[PDB]
Structures are given as structure tokens and as C-alpha cells.
């Protein structure tokens, strides 16, 4: 069998954007196995060892003035540049969520009824899902499975609401997402 | 509010290498090291942008050279295997005879080498399946997705079978219509 020891090296250039291209930070990092050893943080301006392993590298790289000037300028030439190139099909990408409401198949607890608000196939990930009972928001009883990133530029999530239904009540699942100007709503008529 | 990542890695002794761009966690593209071409995650991206694959090939060579030096410098300290967390879900609420897709989430693992297979009633499925390359994580472990298009039925029982050095035995994640 194959029992040879493995040795991994990762190099990551993270461009962090705040308010579009208003505030940008470049974080260059090297990871040996699962240990980040050295990095260049544009907020710092030079390489810094994260662990003893990376000391030789931060020292050598910081002695290279040309490398340093280019890395410092990269926030512009690389980060803001790539943001401008991809912004149209990434930052501005929008896929409206498919929203449906139905009762869970679990329903433990007799004179009770847990509702399920399924929100799927959307993009971007930022989304707000709230439950309401007769026009007023539900604070307690609400439970979410969390935001699920599908890996195909699509997200899904389930937000449940425990209820003690009374004929005539209207339970609404409201979804606010960048894909729509006004909130999406689906009502459960009890 | 946004993060774009150019992520790279080289793994010995497997000779595995990867170069990819990430946007808020979703892959923009990766470079096919053998064909030496850009592989866009979504077809349309290739119509809105371009990339010089040669840049990835140059970097990967530096990454390996660096790995070799670092491996020696660490007195050949090997990576500690971290088994993946495996989950199987549909991309949309399942309903009988309505086309859907099973997603196998392989997460929080390292090193970036795994064997993933789909099972339909104990037998391996190949038709229409697809997968992603290894995606980066903040803790420096990896994520990966495998997909299986299918037609729901109350009879079939699926399994996402995952093998990884961190697992003592193959992990079979069961999935069956329960709606």
C-alpha cells in the first residue's frame, strides 16, 4: 500500500475588499503543511514570519526592495485590477431564490406544527429570512440550518418555525435578497 | 464584503499541483496543468474574462521548488492527515420523479487527495456525475464537491463513498428519499 509521508506547500494571495474598491488589503500567505509560516500583509508593508519556520523567508524577501515595492503596489495593480475585471460577473451576479413553504415531516409534538421555509438556488449568499405571525415578526421558535454554499455559485438554506396553529392565522416567510427590489413572501394559512 | 483568492499548492510525493481563483468561496477557475489551459467554473465566465494559463505553470514550478526547500528545512516533518466531514444533500427540495441533484460535500480535510464514488443500490454510478477541484479554507484545510444528477424514487438508496488517508476505512454517506 501507499504509506509514504506527505509534504504540502500552499501559496495564497487574498485580496480583501471593503466598499468595493474603496479599501483594499492584500494578504499573501505561505502554508507549509497546516502551518502558516510567513505572510505579507499590505497593512503592515513587509513580510512577517508567523512561525519560526518562516523566519528565513521573511528576512530574505524583506531584503528584496523590488519585491517589496511591487507587493505594496499590488493592492492597486493586482487587487483593484482584478476586481474591476471580474466585478461584472461576480460582485454583480444575481440569481433569485426559489422559495417554498410546507410543514416539516418531523412534527414531534402533537398540537404543534413546525413550518419549513425552503430558500434555494440563490446568489449571492447574503440573504435575510424572517418569519411573521399575523404581521408581527417571530423572535423565538425560529431555527435555521445555516447558509449552505453548494459550490456551483448557488446557495440554499432552511429556516424552520415552531408554531401552535390556530385556524385563521397567517404565518409568513419573508425573504430579502439582492436579486429582488422588494421582499419575497410565502404564506402558510393555518 | 468581498474576497478574491489566488490559491496554489504542490504536494509531494504525489506530485499534485493546483492553481485557482476564488471569489467569496466560489471558484472562478483553475488551470488544467496537463492541457495547460484555463478551466472556468461556469461556462459564461470564459466569455466575460480571460486568463493566461502559462502564469500558473510558472508559479507551480516555484511552489514545488519552495516545497522541497521547506520540507528539508523542517527536517522532513510530514503533514498530519485530517479526515473529511462528509455530507450529502439535494440542491432543491426533493419530490418524486422531479429531476434533482445530489451534492456530496467533502470538507475540512488535508492533504488534498481523495477518492470519491457514487453508489446507487450498492453499485457505482458514473452517468452525468461531475466534481470540483480542491478549494481553499481559512484554516488551510480543503473543501471539494461531487455531483450526481438523479430522478427521485422511493426505491433507490444512494451513497457518497469517500476514501482519505485520515479515515481508517471508506466512509459511506447514505442518502435516500425521505420526503
Amino acid at each position: 500500500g501507499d504509506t509514504r509521508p506527505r509534504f504540502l506547500w500552499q501559496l495564497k494571495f487574498e485580496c480583501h475588499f471593503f466598499n468595493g474598491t474603496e479599501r483594499v488589503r492584500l494578504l499573501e500567505r505561505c502554508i507549509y503543511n497546516q502551518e502558516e509560516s510567513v505572510r505579507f500583509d499590505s497593512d503592515v508593508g513587509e513580510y512577517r514570519a508567523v512561525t519560526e519556520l518562516g523566519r528565513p523567508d521573511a528576512e530574505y524577501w524583506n531584503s528584496q526592495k523590488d519585491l517589496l515595492e511591487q507587493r505594496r503596489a499590488a493592492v492597486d495593480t493586482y487587487c483593484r485590477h482584478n476586481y474591476g475585471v471580474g466585478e461584472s460577473f461576480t460582485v454583480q451576479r444575481r440569481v433569485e431564490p426559489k422559495v417554498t413553504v410546507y410543514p416539516s415531516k418531523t412534527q414531534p409534538l402533537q398540537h404543534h406544527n413546525l413550518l419549513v421555509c425552503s430558500v434555494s438556488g440563490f446568489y449571492p449568499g447574503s440573504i435575510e429570512v424572517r418569519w411573521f405571525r399575523n404581521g408581527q415578526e417571530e423572535k423565538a421558535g425560529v431555527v435555521s440550518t445555516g447558509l449552505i454554499q453548494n459550490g456551483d455559485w448557488t446557495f440554499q438554506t432552511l429556516v424552520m418555525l415552531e408554531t401552535v396553529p390556530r385556524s385563521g392565522e397567517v404565518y409568513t416567510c419573508q425573504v430579502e435578497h439582492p436579486s429582488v427590489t422588494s421582499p419575497l413572501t410565502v404564506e402558510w394559512r393555518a | 464584503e468581498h474576497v478574491i483568492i489566488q490559491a496554489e499548492f504542490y504536494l509531494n510525493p504525489d506530485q499534485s499541483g493546483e492553481f485557482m481563483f476564488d471569489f467569496d468561496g466560489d471558484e472562478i477557475f483553475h488551470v488544467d496543468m496537463a492541457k495547460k489551459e484555463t478551466v472556468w467554473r461556469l461556462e459564461e465566465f470564459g466569455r466575460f474574462a480571460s486568463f493566461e494559463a502559462q502564469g500558473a505553470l510558472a508559479n507551480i514550478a516555484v511552489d514545488k521548488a519552495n516545497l522541497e526547500i521547506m520540507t528539508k528545512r523542517s527536517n522532513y516533518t510530514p503533514i498530519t492527515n485530517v479526515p473529511p466531514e462528509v455530507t450529502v444533500l439535494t440542491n432543491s427540495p426533493v419530490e418524486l420523479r422531479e429531476p434533482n441533484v445530489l451534492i456530496c460535500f467533502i470538507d475540512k480535510f488535508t492533504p488534498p487527495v481523495v477518492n470519491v464514488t457514487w453508489l446507487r443500490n450498492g453499485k457505482p454510478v458514473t452517468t452525468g456525475v461531475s466534481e470540483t477541484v480542491f478549494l481553499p479554507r481559512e484554516d488551510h484545510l480543503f473543501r471539494k464537491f461531487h455531483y450526481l444528477p438523479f430522478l427521485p424514487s422511493t426505491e433507490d438508496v444512494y451513497d457518497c463513498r469517500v476514501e482519505h488517508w485520515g479515515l481508517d476505512e471508506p466512509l459511506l454517506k447514505h442518502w435516500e428519499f425521505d420526503a
Binding site: 475585471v85 | 474574462a49 486568463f51
Partner: peptide, 15 residues
Amino acid sequence: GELIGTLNAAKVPAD
């Protein structure tokens, strides 16, 4: 489309 740019990998100090 518009070209996505690459940042080049820095070589670690030699043995």
C-alpha cells in the same frame, strides 16, 4: 474578456 492578472510566486532563500 478582460485579463485576470496573476501575482508571481516568490522564491524562498536557497539551501
